[PDB]
Amino acid sequence: RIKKISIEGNIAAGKSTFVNILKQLCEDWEVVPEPVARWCNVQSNGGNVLQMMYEKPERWSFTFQTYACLSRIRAQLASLNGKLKDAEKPVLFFERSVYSDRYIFASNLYESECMNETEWTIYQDWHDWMNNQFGQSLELDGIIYLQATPETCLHRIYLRGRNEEQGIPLEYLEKLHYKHESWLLHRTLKTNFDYLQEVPILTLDVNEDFKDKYESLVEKVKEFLSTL
Amino acid sequence: RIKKISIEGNIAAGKSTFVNILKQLCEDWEVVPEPVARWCNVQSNGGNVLQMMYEKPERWSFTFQTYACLSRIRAQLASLNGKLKDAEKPVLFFERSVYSDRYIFASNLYESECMNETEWTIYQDWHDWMNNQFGQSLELDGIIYLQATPETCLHRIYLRGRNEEQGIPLEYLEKLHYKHESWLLHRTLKTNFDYLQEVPILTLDVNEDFKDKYESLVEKVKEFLSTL
Numbered sequence A, B: 001r002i003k004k005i006s007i008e009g010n011i012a013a014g015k016s017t018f019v020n021i022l023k024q025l026c027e028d029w030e031v032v033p034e035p036v037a038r039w040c041n042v043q044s045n046g047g048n049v050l051q052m053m054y055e056k057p058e059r060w061s062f063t064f065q066t067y068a069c070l071s072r073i074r075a076q077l078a079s080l081n082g083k084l085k086d087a088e089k090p091v092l093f094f095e096r097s098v099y100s101d102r103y104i105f106a107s108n109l110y111e112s113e114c115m116n117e118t119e120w121t122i123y124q125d126w127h128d129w130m131n132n133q134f135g136q137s138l139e140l141d142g143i144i145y146l147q148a149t150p151e152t153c154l155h156r157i158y159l160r161g162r163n164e165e166q167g168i169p170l171e172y173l174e175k176l177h178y179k180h181e182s183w184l185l186h187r188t189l190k191t192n193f194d195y196l197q198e199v200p201i202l203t204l205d206v207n208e209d210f211k212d213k214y215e216s217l218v219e220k221v222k223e224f225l226s227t228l
């Protein structure tokens, strides 16, 4: 029914900022923000599991990573039943997908030895079965990679200001950067979701500053969306 | 269209042993064993998360408890599509239910301070949403409580021999015992699944030794099943 485009990018790269500009350029375009809000206040003041991961990764990576992906699957499946389901030409933009959760972050945490074998095995096993029960619904129809130097991201991470991610070193932002390049740019990163190989991928260089000048980016999106 | 009976009990109380006797008393009765096998070898050589929980509970309780319940939901939903779905009067016996996972074990681990607030909150939140997406399918039609002194269980735990659970002290078996008594016997334990209040519950005293003498128990089950 509804066309589901995913907005991939690094940390503080600028998805939200970007999609918010898109969101108000048509009432047939609804966004599904990353449930970061709830990751910072686990509830049904509760605990801030995002911070726990940052403070002691070798201990909370699993928990966080699991919770983070679930919360997303829900949030997205949820939006699929919004009043958007009625309009003529609907488009639902996702702030990051279950794919980048597992293949970019979880994956990298594992490689960073922050998830023992068992944790990574369980994580994958779960992640697989998860997208096999609600897969159909969330399959993407396109992906928009907001590319940006890990330097820029490190900078924007500071401009944003979330106190949890203020300790993030460039090394980290870098490792995640390559993970994106490898998957969405060079397409050398293999997943376990065959259909992802035949998915359109628009790559925009958001290193500049689209707060003001963004006319360009926008046109390339209308462009890209037509071809779907 | 299949009647789902749950066989509740303590550790090494005798569900398996018992249900195996039931299993071969009619070809319209299929069992769904606890996926313990896989808990002892994640991705079937891997890791043994059951043991991890026992060695360092304050660290692996969450992971284990989460995995254990998921693995069950799958295992059970899976069996609901077996060739049993065809026979005339079908009955599917579950070795423990998602209810006892959360309300007996997870719950007790939390109270034993083996799950910090955050872990317990996330665990519940997840568990709730889980039985709200696949609830319908797994609702029980009856429960059979195999009652037995924590002493007997401690003994049978030794007869069985799983090296992971050889360190279990009576105190533990005891705590879990009361949790069962409170829920299935005195019914004073409140859950978050309204329908469980109106569920038939047969209680059998398996403290003796049904390996041989079990004619009795069996009749009480045929009896109980008729009333459903």
Ligand SMILES: O=c1ccn([C@@H]2O[C@H](COP(=O)(O)OP(=O)(O)O)[C@@H](O)[C@H]2O)c(=O)[nH]1
Residues within 6 Å of the ligand: A009, A010, A011, A012, A013, A014, A015, A016, A017, A018, A156, A159, A160, A208, A209, A210, A211, A212
């Ligand atoms: O051209 C730009 C684009 C973004 N930002 C900053 O990017 C931050 C938001 O980063 P964001 O949360 O959008 O990263 P995301 O959550 O989308 O991945 C905002 O505070 C903006 O100040 C900026 O200063 N100039």
Ligand SMILES: O=c1ccn([C@@H]2O[C@H](COP(=O)(O)OP(=O)(O)O)[C@@H](O)[C@H]2O)c(=O)[nH]1
Residues within 6 Å of the ligand: B009, B010, B011, B012, B013, B014, B015, B016, B017, B018, B156, B159, B160, B208, B209, B210, B211, B212
């Ligand atoms: O009357 C009995 C019933 C059972 N068992 C022992 O119980 C063990 C199995 O315990 P079980 O695995 O059935 O506990 P469950 O997994 O059903 O909760 C077997 O090795 C039997 O030797 C026994 O000795 N006498």
Ligand SMILES: Nc1ncnc2c1ncn2[C@H]1C[C@H](O)[C@@H](COP(=O)(O)O)O1
Residues within 6 Å of the ligand: A010, A011, A012, A013, A034, A036, A050, A065, A068, A096, A100, A101, A102, A105, A106, A164, A165
């Ligand atoms: N999948 C996953 N695993 C681990 N940590 C994550 C994940 N997604 C987001 N985050 C965390 C890490 C960053 O501090 C922040 C980025 O939010 P963002 O909107 O992406 O800039 O949230």
Ligand SMILES: Nc1ncnc2c1ncn2[C@H]1C[C@H](O)[C@@H](COP(=O)(O)O)O1
Residues within 6 Å of the ligand: B010, B011, B012, B013, B034, B036, B050, B065, B068, B096, B100, B101, B102, B105, B106, B164, B165
């Ligand atoms: N829900 C749950 N939480 C934690 N540990 C569990 C759970 N279920 C089984 N087990 C473990 C604990 C015992 O050593 C054994 C009991 O298997 P059994 O067939 O139950 O006698 O398996």
Ligand SMILES: [Mg+2]
Residues within 6 Å of the ligand: A015, A016, A034, A095
């Ligand atoms: Mg955001």
Ligand SMILES: [Mg+2]
Residues within 6 Å of the ligand: B016, B034, B036, B095
């Ligand atoms: Mg058993």
